[PDB]
């Protein structure tokens, strides 16, 4: 979006401006940096607003967790809410008759796996060997922080034969000030560093690593759980144009989970939220 150089769309118009008009444009360039600096302060206030609203959302998220885990039963008010909207005639009543109750089925099985995999972006990171692991996810939560600035996403897993961790954490440290390397490019909070989480895999279960062979080396294998081994920033590095797009992809997937899936999880569970490619 923001270009740096002789590639600007109206360069030839700029080049022909008399010097005194050029100097007026320079002043607007300076003023534009002040405008972006104020936008930075705005984004900081929005971040604190999101922090403040965690307590407000908490009740509905906790009740969802309790319902999904089978720890609380639906009320009559909840039962009278249609499972799906926009159904003609007897279709709702017939939908409720299509499968009798099963008291052995507790809570909502595979809720978070189904919600995650129905979002097109997160779906692209879920391989088939990830599916039986994500079936043990009991909750996905998110919390933001002011100091240091950023947020985290936590994946809660019941006891499972894949790994010992009960919570897998992904943490994003964000910069809210305009970039000193490019002040005019600031478009909101930007990821400084993504910090993953060490997975304590049981024997033979690490689907993120594979060996290839005179020499044998361990290489990355496609897996959603590479979400917890994010690529390093330049400050910790030892390809730069391709590691940094991968970090942006990882951050964008984090943003989708935090901003979209977690607040609207059941609509992805049903598949009522769809994306036209």
């Amino acid at each position: 979006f923001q270009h740096m150089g002789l590639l600007s769309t109206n360069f030839d118009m700029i080049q022909a401006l008399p010097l005194n008009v050029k100097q007026r444009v320079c002043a607007l360039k300076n003023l534009q940096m002040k405008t972006i600096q104020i936008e930075s302060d705005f984004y900081k206030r929005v971040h604190e607003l999101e922090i403040e609203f965690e307590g407000k959302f908490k009740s509905t998220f906790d009740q969802r967790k309790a319902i999904v885990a089978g720890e609380v039963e639906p009320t009559k008010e909840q039962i009278d809410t249609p499972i799906l909207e926009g159904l003609e005639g007897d279709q709702l009543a017939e939908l409720y008759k299509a499968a009798e109750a099963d008291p052995s089925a507790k809570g909502i099985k595979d809720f978070w796996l189904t919600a995650l995999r129905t979002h097109d972006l997160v779906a692209e990171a879920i391989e088939e060997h990830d599916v039986p692991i994500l079936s043990y996810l009991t909750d996905v939560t998110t919390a933001a922080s002011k100091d240091p600035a950023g947020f985290k996403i936590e994946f809660h897993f019941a006891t499972n034969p894949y790994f010992k961790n009960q919570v897998l954490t992904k943490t994003y440290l964000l910069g809210f000030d305009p970039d000193a390397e490019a002040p005019l490019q600031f478009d909101g909070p930007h990821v400084i560093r993504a910090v993953g989480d060490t997975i304590e895999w049981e024997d033979g279960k690490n689907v993120t690593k594979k060996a290839v062979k005179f020499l044998t080396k361990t290489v990355k294998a496609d897996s959603f759980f590479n979400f917890f081994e994010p690529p390093k920033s330049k400050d910790e590095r030892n390809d730069d144009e391709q590691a940094e797009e991968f970090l942006e992809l990882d951050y964008e997937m984090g943003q989708a989970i935090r901003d979209t899936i977690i607040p609207r999880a059941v609509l992805f569970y049903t598949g009522e939220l769809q994306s036209d490619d």
């Binding site: 097109d120 391989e127 088939e128 598949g271 036209d276 490619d277």
Partner: protein, 179 residues
């Protein structure tokens, strides 16, 4: 293979070929099984063909060859013509509207990457080609089924209409039983 949902796209193709016709849920579930089962045969054949290339690539031509191996007779020829046209429109809005298709190019691209056992890239034109082939078959199966259902003076495509559509087509009947 896990059965993906194309219902919304199957419904959009239907409102084209028969704007006045509806489709029951059960009929919609058979259509989805049909698309999924065809797609998995296309994917399996494309993986086997990709191994005869340098970096094990699945392009629009690896899908075209697989279609020629899976679709019999005129079905192949018509699907190949619709697949080439879709690829040509895409390479010249959303990815599917770029190819003139209602079926989802983005989702089918992902389905190809995860289902195929080859080691190399899956090109976007292979997704475009695949979607056009599944759409064509869907549109053909819907045109025959919607034709049948109006013969019976009813405004809804049911499993009975689908079954009559396919058993009244030598190529479609052969395709389904081979699958």
């Amino acid at each position: 293979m896990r059965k993906e949902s194309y219902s919304v796209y199957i419904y959009r193709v239907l409102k084209q070929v028969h704007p006045d016709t509806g489709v029951s849920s059960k009929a919609m579930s058979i259509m989805n099984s049909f698309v999924n089962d065809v797609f998995e045969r296309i994917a399996a054949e494309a993986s086997r063909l990709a191994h005869y290339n340098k970096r094990s690539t699945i392009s629009s031509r690896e899908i075209q060859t697989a279609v020629r191996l899976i679709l019999p007779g005129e079905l192949a020829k018509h699907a190949v013509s619709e697949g080439t046209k879709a690829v040509t429109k895409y390479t010249s809005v959303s990815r599917s509207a770029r190819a003139g298709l209602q079926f989802p190019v983005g989702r089918i691209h992902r389905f190809l990457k995860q289902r195929t056992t080859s080691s190399g890239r899956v090109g976007a034109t292979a997704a475009v080609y695949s979607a056009a082939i599944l759409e064509y078959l869907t549109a053909e199966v819907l045109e025959l089924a919607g034709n049948a259902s109006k013969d019976l003076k009813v405004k809804r495509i049911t499993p009975r209409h689908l079954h009559l559509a396919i058993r009244g087509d030598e190529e479609l009947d052969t395709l389904i039983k081979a699958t």
